[model samples]
Target: DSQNMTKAAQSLNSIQVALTQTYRGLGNYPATADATAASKLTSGLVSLGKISSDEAKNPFIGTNMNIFSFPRNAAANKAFAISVDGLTQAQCKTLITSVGDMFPYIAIKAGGAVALADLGDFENSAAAAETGVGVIKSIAPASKNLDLTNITHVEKLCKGTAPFGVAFGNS
Candidate 1:
C-alpha cells in the first residue's frame, strides 16, 4: 500500500527541493560514500524538516533510499544520486521515464558499473550500492550523454536492478 509510484516520486522531489537549499548555502556538496553516509545526510534533512516525515518515506521500506552526495573526496568530486530500491521492473521503467533523462548520470546495478569518462567509476564511490555521479572537477564537459529518457534504450543499459539511481541538475 505504501509503495506506489506517485508517493515515491513525490518523496524524491520533496528531498530534492530540500537539498537544493542546503547545497546552495554551501555552494557545493559526503563523508564515506556509503549507504550509511547517505542515511546520515537524509537524517540531517529530516532534522531540518526539509522533507516531511510521511512524504520523505519512499514507497519501498517507508524510508528515503536516495544518495544525496557522492562518496569519495566530496570537494574533489561533483556527484550526487537519487535511488529507490524494492521495485518491479515496470515500476522502475515508470519512475525513470517520469523523472526524465534531464541529468547526465544514470545509475543501476547493471548500469551501476559505470566506467565511462563522463562521471566516474561508480563502483568505487559507495562500495556495494555505488552510483557514480560526477568525476573530479576540471573536466566539466563530457562526450557521453547517459540520460534515461527512453525505457528501451535505458533498459539495455540498466537492467532495472532493484535500485535505479541517477544524478541531479546543474548547481
Candidate 2:
C-alpha cells in the first residue's frame, strides 16, 4: 500500500507533540485535589518511571511549538532535516492541533490512575531485562549487562544533546 514507501519517521515528530500535550494534561489533571484521576496518570507514569528525574522536572519544556531537528538518529544533511523555519505559520498551527488528537489516549490512560497492575508488571519486566531494575524477563541471560545509566550516553551519540524547556500552562 501507499504506507510502505511513506516516511513513518516523521510520525515520531508528530507523536512527540501529542506526547507533550499528554504530559501537560496529566500534570494539570489533579492539581486541585490531594490526588484525583489525573493524579493517577502522573503516578502511573511514575510506575512506568521510564523518564529520568531530570526529565520529570521539565518533560514539557521543549515541546511548546518549538522547532526540533528531525531524523534524530540518521545522518546529517544526507538525511532530511525539516526545521521549523521550513514550516509556514499554518503548518505550525496544524502541528499544534495534531497534538490535540493525541490527548484522548493520554487522558484515558491517565484517567485510569495508578496504572492497572498489568502495565506495571510489563514495565517491571522491561526494566529488569534492561538490567536496571531486577530480574531479566524478556532478554536472554546470556545478554550483556546493559546499564540504564548509559541511556544518556546513547542519546548523546545520536542527537548530541537533550533539549530543555520551562513548564507552561495550557489554557
Candidate 3:
C-alpha cells in the first residue's frame, strides 16, 4: 500500500529489462534457449514502462573508481584523518608496492584534549591505504579514534600530512 513499495516494484521491471538486454548482448545462449526467447523476455520487461529505451539498450559495462570513508560523523576535538599519496596505475594493481602504513591512532594533547595522531613509523603506503580503508570500515568507525574525514585534517595532525586510503575500480 505504500508508495515506496509501488515505486520499487515499478523499478524492478526496468532492472529486468536491463538484465535481459545484457544477456542478449552476450549473443550466446544455450540451444534450448534461443535469442528469440531472450528478446521476448526483454520485450515483456520493457512493456512494463518501468524502464526507458536507453536504459534497456545499454547495460552497465564499465569500471568506476569509488572512494568511501567510514565514520561518516564529525566528532569534536578528535582528529579523524584519512589520506592517500603516491598512487599510480602500477601501484594500485600491485599490493606489495611499497608506500606507507599508518595506524588510526589518536592522542590526548595538553589539557587532556583528544586529537588525531600522526604516524611516525613508515611502512608501505599502498598497503597502508588498503589497511586504512579496511580498518575504517571494519573497526575504526566504531573504535571512535580521532575521527577525520579528509586529507587536510590528517596533514594538519602531522607536520607533513599525506594521503592514506584505498582506491579501486569497479568492473
Candidate 4:
C-alpha cells in the first residue's frame, strides 16, 4: 500500500488545487460567489471522484481500489473509485471554508482535514465559535488574534458581503 502513496499524493494535489481555485473564485478574491457555478464545480469534482484531502499527511482520504461492471467484459474490470458518502450540505460548506483557510496567507493549522473528519465536534467546539481558534488556530510557533482584515473570502461570501469589498468599478 505504501508503494501507492506517491500516486495518491499526486492525485490529491490535483483535486485540492481545483477546489481551492473554485473557492477563491466564489469568494470573489479574484469574482463573486455564483451559486450555480459553485454547484457545478463541486458536483463536477464529486462526479470525477477527485475530491482531495486537505491534510498533507494522508492525501488519498483513506480510499482504495474496486471492481466495476462494463458492457463488454464478461468478467468485470477492476478500476479505482473513491467514494464519499453521507455528507450534508452544511458539512460541505464547512469543507469549502476549511479549504479556503488553507491558503498560504491564512494557513490554519489542521483546518480542513480536522474539521472534515469530525464535523460535529468542530462545529460544536468553543474554538469553532471564535473566529481565531478551533479549526482556525494559527499555525505559528505561538498564536495570533483572529484578524478580521484576513477574514476568509468564503465566509465573506457566506455572510452575503461583497467578497472583495464593495467594488469601485462598473460591473
Which scores better on TM-score, 1 or 3? 1
Error of 3 at 39 (Å): 0.9
**2 or 3, which is superior by lDDT?**
3
Q: lDDT, candidate 1, residue 138?
A: 19
lDDT (Cα) of model 1: 0.48
Candidate 3 lDDT, tens digit per residue, 1-171? Answer: 334223323333345344345444554221212223434543554566634544334211111111111121232211122122232222222221221122223211122111112211111111123123222221233342222455543333322122222221100
The regions of model 2 sitting more than 4 angstroms off are 1-7, 22-116, 121-126, 130-171
What candidate 4 gets wrong by more than 4 Å, as runs, is 28-44, 48-171
lDDT sort, best first: 1, 4, 3, 2
Can you give the TM-score per candidate against the true fold?
A: 0.63, 0.19, 0.19, 0.27
RMSD of 4: 17.4
Ranking by TM-score: 1, 4, 2, 3
Model 3 C-alpha RMSD to native: 19.6
In candidate 2, what are the lDDT values of residues 24-125, reduced to their tens digit? Answer: 444322222212332343334434543322332211222212212111122211111111212222322233234323221110111111122211221112
How many residue pairs of model 4 clash at the backbone? 1
Per-prediction RMSD in angstroms? 6.7, 18.8, 19.6, 17.4
Q: Over 4 Å off in model 3, which ranges?
A: 1-32, 59-171
Q: Can you write out model 4's per-residue Cα lDDT over 49-147, one digit (the tens) per residue? A: 545323222222343211111111122111111112222333333433433333311212222221112211211222231332233322233334234
For candidate 1, write residues 67-135 as lDDT tens digits. Answer: 555432335334456556555556555665565343333444333422223234333432111122232
lDDT of 3: 0.27
In model 1, residue pairs whose N, Cα or C atoms come closer than 3 Å (at least 3 residues apart or on different chains), thus clashing, are 33-71, 108-112
Q: Would you list the clashing residue pairs of candidate 4?
A: 28-31
Per-candidate local distance difference test: 0.48, 0.24, 0.27, 0.28
